[PDB]
Swiss-Prot record, chain A:
Descriptive protein name: Nitric oxide synthase 3
Annotated function: Produces nitric oxide (NO) which is implicated in vascular smooth muscle relaxation through a cGMP-mediated signal transduction pathway. NO mediates vascular endothelial growth factor (VEGF)-induced angiogenesis in coronary vessels and promotes blood clotting through the activation of platelets.
GO cellular component terms attached to this protein's record: caveola; cytoplasm; cytoskeleton; cytosol; endocytic vesicle membrane; Golgi apparatus; Golgi membrane; nucleus
Record organism: Homo sapiens
Tissue and organ distribution: Platelets, placenta, liver and kidney.
Keywords, in A-Z order: Calcium, Calmodulin-binding, Cell membrane, Cytoplasm, Cytoskeleton, FAD, Flavoprotein, FMN, Golgi apparatus, Heme, Iron, Lipoprotein, Membrane, Metal-binding, Myristate, NADP, Oxidoreductase, Palmitate, Phosphoprotein, Zinc
Gene: NOS3
Annotated positions binding L-arginine: 171, 280-281, 285, 290
GO biological process, alphabetically ordered: angiogenesis; aortic valve morphogenesis; arginine catabolic process; blood vessel diameter maintenance; blood vessel remodeling; calcium ion transport; cell redox homeostasis; endocardial cushion morphogenesis
Coiled coil: none
UniProt similarity note: Belongs to the NOS family.
Length: 404, 402
């Protein structure tokens, strides 16, 4: 039972939940690989064992463990698999599954919200157009005219044999990236790949560097097709700065809804290749990684030049100065537009609150320190000086190979 | 079957074969990771010692030679007669450097090959100890142009006690417990301050009182020593434009000289072997001055900057902090005392990784410690994957002798 200490306060806790961890991670006693983005890499007897674990933590989670309906539900599931191979979840369990997996996402700093997640059951989906509507309701529900709401939409579970549902975009809302006779990129270089996969599917390229990409959806076996997004349901925020009047004229913007559509939801031993979720941004994601990463928009030195900072030398800390103000502009803009946003100080402190809750509940909490700690002002936030244990619980969100 | 490590900023892929030599085991299992934890006979001395001799004769391109096979036989025979063995002049220099080179949490290792090794293995008392220490500080400080150095005191041996330096650093500021239940000076050194005073030291009342040394010879009680005022170089902290900053009465010292870690070389352990380099501005600016439990000036500074401290989204914490770092970097250059900012430091650390990959095919590195405590993703070490492991020679922790 690992001794985890908070060095800011001096409190000490033992992580008993880590003991009930399961599927092994990339670390061994001779070398720690906990800074790896993808943990190493990417007659079904398995399903039943995974199926009981989930059903049982379901019923213990509502006290109804032992005898009566609990006794009863386990048999119907045993019967269901024995005859069919796969099995179906009761809708309540699906909600349970969705929520617990958000609770078990080691890299996510917004888990204090895990008890508040809207679950759109789309297991009866049968088409490529049928996904697209199920998506549009999500975006509209989740955007809620800027008062963002946590939501996930589960599409039908991939079957024994035969194809699966799969969204092809990393996110439902992404900007394009274009090449040229310089080979450089106008737009979002992270999404050039999918933009490449779009144009040769019939899409027409664009003008500026903030062209919202078109969705590329795909139902079993019949190859994917394009779906153009309605601009009313893609709410963006133009970026301005509370006192740097020249900042607006950089023509910067970002979308409201962070909604990730290429990860795999696993519940009770079933795999959902298509099951996109959404919440709301933390400022640093937009201002620090999306706008300032060298292999992203890379706006840093432009902002510095407008601030008349000394870029000739690193010790002037112009990089740090411009970053802080770009972040200030994100938080300001989003609140002007009345779109839900959280600063990294408020987000982290609530994640402390979340640990303390989880301690009384499940005696531990899988947390990935290299990701909970914010990408700027790290030590200034409470999570920095807090020791964490990272491990794998189920249900969980898993990465998966991309289908191109 | 060696770790594949990627740099995501550029796109580089290398494999860490050096990690397979990892001559120890840490806290991480396939079941869970504990990378964030701060604290993670004759035959056995034999296998470690034999490994270091093999190391040393490779660095001078003479592996498997006459002098090598001689040196092996010499060693294992001497452990049979005495229980231990003594390092030569040149081996001690090599082991010392190899310990810096291997230290996973150090971003300044680009410089490991330039370390001034002092041999004080002949030390006899607490007074000679002080004298070697005063001399170290003098060479290293160098009137502001800093120099990397280590002083090596007598190795741990059976039958005699240990040399220890009781202070965590050669230079540290006093921490006075107040009537209010507050602390004057540095709160991190409340404990060592206790010991000094109860061992006959006359306490000051300042926020930056430089602590005496508690120095202990074998089987002796520790003996108190005052560093000559003019030996310790200190830097007044001011800000290039915020002029009220200087009225804060803040200062920091030039030489960071960690004095409480253990130096292990080929199975021998030197419990007293202080070493020093120069400061990176964030250690002083972010960590020492802004950590809530240390000097805690962050809020008190933002209030002066007229920032909105009533709410987080104004990022008043982040703004205060960057100007505190700026003040550190400015004050040290104004006083011509060597210092390195976290962009330059991480940048040179990336050269080191390129160097070590060609030299030993890898590099022990602790991601959580290599990434500066402000502005991580701005630095090139943020987006670089790393492998943490333990190679020997090495600097290790050890308990407080009290
Ligand atoms: C509501 C406020 C939320 C905030 C502020 C938030 C914030 C974050 C942040 C900062 C990351 C780091 C990943 C990156 O840097 O790209 C992350 C990752 C993650 N989040 Fe959250 N999130 C929220 C909601 C949610 C929801 C609703 C879910 C699921 C239903 C979720 C599940 C996850 C998962 C699985 C990851 C890991 C992604 C990966 O491994 O690459 N989060 N989140
Ligand atoms: C010359 C300039 C140097 C710089 C800029 C530098 C930088 C750093 C920094 C910033 C840390 C982490 C600080 C912290 O704990 O907050 C560190 C750790 C460390 N460095 Fe250095 N260093 C330098 C010289 C040296 C030398 C000369 C040695 C050995 C002779 C050394 C060995 C170590 C070791 C063993 C640690 C880890 C200590 C621990 O884990 O508690 N460094 N370095
Ligand atoms: C930029 N980091 C990438 C390099 C790694 C990454 C991979 C995947 C996948 N698959 C998905 C990723 O998305 C991260 C994520 C997922 C969900 C989020 C939600 C729901 C809210 C939020 N504010 N940020 C999120 C961030 C990231
Ligand atoms: C504030 N850090 C603590 C939380 C952890 C720590 C513990 C010890 C010990 N013993 C020693 C430590 O030393 C860090 C260190 C060691 C050597 C350094 C040198 C030689 C130079 C430099 N600029 N910084 C150093 C920083 C750290
Ligand atoms: C190399 C490094 O581990 C990796 O790029 C991680 C570090 N921490 C991160 N943290 C968050 N939130 N998002 C990221 O993309 C990363 N990148
Ligand atoms: C608990 C936390 O991981 C620990 O306090 C570490 C994090 N990384 C660090 N990195 C450096 N360079 N110095 C430190 O003191 C710390 N503190
Ligand atoms: Cl994003
Ligand atoms: Cl220090
Ligand atoms: Gd101007
Ligand atoms: Gd001024
Ligand atoms: Zn690990
Ligand atoms: Zn700190």
């Amino acid at each position: 039972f690992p001794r985890v200490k908070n060095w800011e306060v001096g409190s000490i806790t033992y992580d008993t939940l880590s003991a009930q961890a399961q599927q092994d991670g990339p670390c061994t006693p001779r070398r720690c690989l906990g800074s790896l983005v993808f943990p190493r890499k990417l007659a079904p007897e398995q399903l039943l064992s995974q199926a009981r674990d989930f059903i049982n933590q379901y019923y213990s989670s509502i006290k109804r463990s032992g005898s009566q309906a609990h006794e009863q539900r386990l048999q119907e599931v045993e019967a269901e698999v024995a005859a069919t191979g796969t099995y179906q979840l009761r809708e309540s369990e699906l909600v349970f599954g969705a929520k617990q997996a958000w609770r078990n996402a080691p890299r996510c700093v917004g888990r204090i919200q895990w008890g508040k997640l809207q679950v759109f059951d789309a297991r009866d989906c049968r088409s490529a157009q049928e996904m697209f509507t199920y998506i549009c309701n999500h975006i509209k529900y989740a955007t809620n005219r800027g008062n963002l709401r946590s939501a996930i939409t589960v599409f039908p579970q991939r079957c024994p044999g035969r194809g699966d549902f799969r969204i092809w975009n990393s996110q439902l809302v992404r900007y394009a990236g274009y090449r040229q006779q310089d080979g450089s990129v106008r737009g979002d270089p992270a999404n050039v790949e999918i933009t490449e996969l779009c144009i040769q599917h019939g899409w027409t390229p664009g003008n500026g560097r903030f062209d919202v990409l078109p969705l590329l959806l795909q139902a079993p076996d019949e190859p994917p097709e394009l779906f153009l997004l309605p601009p009313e349901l893609v709410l963006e925020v133009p970026l301005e700065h509370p006192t740097l009047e020249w900042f607006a004229a950089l023509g910067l913007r970002w979308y409201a809804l962070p909604a990730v559509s290429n990860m795999l939801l696993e519940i009770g031993g079933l795999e959902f290749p298509a099951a996109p979720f959404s919440g709301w941004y933390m400022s640093t994601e937009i201002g620090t990684r999306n706008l300032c990463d060298p292999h992203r928009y890379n706006i840093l030195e432009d902002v510095a030049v407008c601030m008349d900072l000394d870029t000739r030398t690193t010790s002037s800390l112009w990089k740090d100065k411009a970053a802080v103000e770009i972040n200030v502009a994100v938080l300001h803009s989003y609140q002007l537009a009345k779109v839900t946003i959280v600063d990294h100080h408020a987000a982290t402190a609530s994640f402390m609150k979340h640990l303390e809750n989880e301690q009384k509940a499940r005696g531990g909490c899988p947390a990935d320190w290299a990701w909970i700690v914010p990408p700027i002002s790290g030590s200034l936030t409470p999570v920095f000086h807090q020791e964490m244990v990272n491990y794998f619980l189920s249900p969980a969100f898993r990465y998966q190979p991309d289908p191109w």
